[PDB]
Write a protein that binds this ligand. Sequence first.
Ligand code: ZN
Ligand code: ZN
Lengths: 366, 366
Amino acid sequence: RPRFSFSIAAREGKARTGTIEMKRGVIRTPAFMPVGTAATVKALKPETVRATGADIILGNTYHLMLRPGAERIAKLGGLHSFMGWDRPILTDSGGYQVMSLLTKQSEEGVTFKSRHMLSPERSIEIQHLLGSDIVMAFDECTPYPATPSRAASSMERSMRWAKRSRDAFDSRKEQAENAALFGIQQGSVFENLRQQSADALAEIGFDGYAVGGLAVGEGQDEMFRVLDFSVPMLPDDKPHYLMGVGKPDDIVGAVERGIDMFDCVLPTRSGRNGQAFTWDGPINIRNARFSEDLKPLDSECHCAVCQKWSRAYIHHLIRAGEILGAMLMTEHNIAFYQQLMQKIRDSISEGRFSQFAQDFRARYFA
Amino acid sequence: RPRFSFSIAAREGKARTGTIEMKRGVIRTPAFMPVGTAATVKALKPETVRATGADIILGNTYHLMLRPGAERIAKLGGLHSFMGWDRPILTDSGGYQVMSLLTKQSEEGVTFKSRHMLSPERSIEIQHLLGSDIVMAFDECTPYPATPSRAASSMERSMRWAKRSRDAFDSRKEQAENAALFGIQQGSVFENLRQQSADALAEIGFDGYAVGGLAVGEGQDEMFRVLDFSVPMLPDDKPHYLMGVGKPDDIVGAVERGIDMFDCVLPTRSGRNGQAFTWDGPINIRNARFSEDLKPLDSECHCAVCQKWSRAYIHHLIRAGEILGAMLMTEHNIAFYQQLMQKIRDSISEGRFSQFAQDFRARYFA
Ligand SMILES: [Zn+2]
Ligand SMILES: [Zn+2]
């Protein structure tokens, strides 16, 4: 396999399906990436993550630099060996934490409170030390809402940081030869700024392009409105990654608008909170109505949890605070997401994705 | 397979090795039973529990009657179906909670504070509703220390309760035909009382005999002293079960004294707390000295955890409070216990158990 090759096998409207080939494996698109923030996808062995259908998982520069440390992970042989996942890993750059989990910001980078520093150069270096396959440029996720002036200033800094990220990545031969680098579009909800950002990123040139600055409280209508004009600005022949999205309905609509890659903590995090995804919409397994329900979480789901255990049992586990409850909920939810992505890929391949989206929504929101 | 058949294949001194055949499976003895208090062995799928080598697991009447409820479990098809473990299950009777997790005690039984009641009849009924394979008599675990007078009074009540347990079990045809009933010897640390208890239990007649009233703070020397005279009082041709024991060294010494069955929360509970068992003694994986240790938890252990992950990774997981840390620690510890039991069984079968015990101790306590 090559360092990086994205091939589009089929299209329907703005939707695409295909593959990213990388050294550590093939990624089927549209793709959902389970989030593995602390060098683990919560409550799952890597083999279980793979069994659900995942081709790639997400790590974070910010969290790993704090614990257990980037240099430490490198000394131990890199993130893949450390956690036991041998397939591709995408790492976020820390740019979301620049306004999240305080800080001192400047043109040079960001200092976080022990004191830690991130900059385009340090972020790219950390991602190298982790041995990330898809490296994200170091950016700033503009807060929402933002005024046009502030959104512009923020976006402009991010584009300068994108160029610095590109140069840092390229100067490190082992990284440049074995990993890929994605740029991140900013510009808040403003079409002109999104266009300027896209132009700057395409001029620099990246292996893939993320739509940043969304899933920050704007709501689905606004997010879709921004995607409507933003995705066509990105190079057509490279993957489009919508950061932090999202709920199943968000994913379907984003694919309709040309997005190829997704990640979110929702299936893992909300799973441990009792929320299970089903084709008839989400349920909260903690609800008393499930206490004697012998049916599986979802009637059609092919996952191992739905083959073996009842709603009643999982209800008991989650209510009791049992670790097995988190394990089963998470495996089901991630498997559900992967089944959704598979149905999306198949329907685009067969030229019936529009019908699938309609059918999905009718049942999910019944 | 029969309802119950215990066969002794080989002996060395007081130690025995053999099998218990029951309808749901064969139990190799000496046996370690992982504890599954809330209808789950903590942090493990039943398939993983089986993969470690476990033939049987333990549930508790007290905990399950409170949550999710005994009648509820029966309505849902019984404990085996509920939790997805199809092999034998032994259930404790609630007698330890009679002084543990307040209460109002009388000759009739015990009322626990919502208000719940246990008696020999109700305990046996609950165990029936759960569908337990090995039912424990309802007893009272005498507190330690106890005066001879109080130990005698307590033991005498337990023997009356043992007869009531026998009659309740026998009056329920489906239970009598498909499950087994074990009596529990009491008498604190007093030889004459232990003898009276053994005589009473043998007169009633049970499928197996537990040594109760130990692992209650007495310490290993005293526990071994009591076992020295107590185990030979029990019928030789039936299994001997030491309730609540214990650490690896406790198990080895108890087998040397004629015990066939063990359970304890130690490998599961202490696993989540960071303690890992090794042939060179226990370690606490939280310790900073393990932060960059690439070796597995134990150098010889055949478990899946030791095949795949480093001390360094597990150290990180436990320090970070990650669920996968609990999963990996628990799987290793239970697998370690099962490997210990296998080495015990093989060594007795080969007439070299005395040498094994000596070799085990020399290395474990080096
Ligand atoms: Zn499922
Ligand atoms: Zn191991």
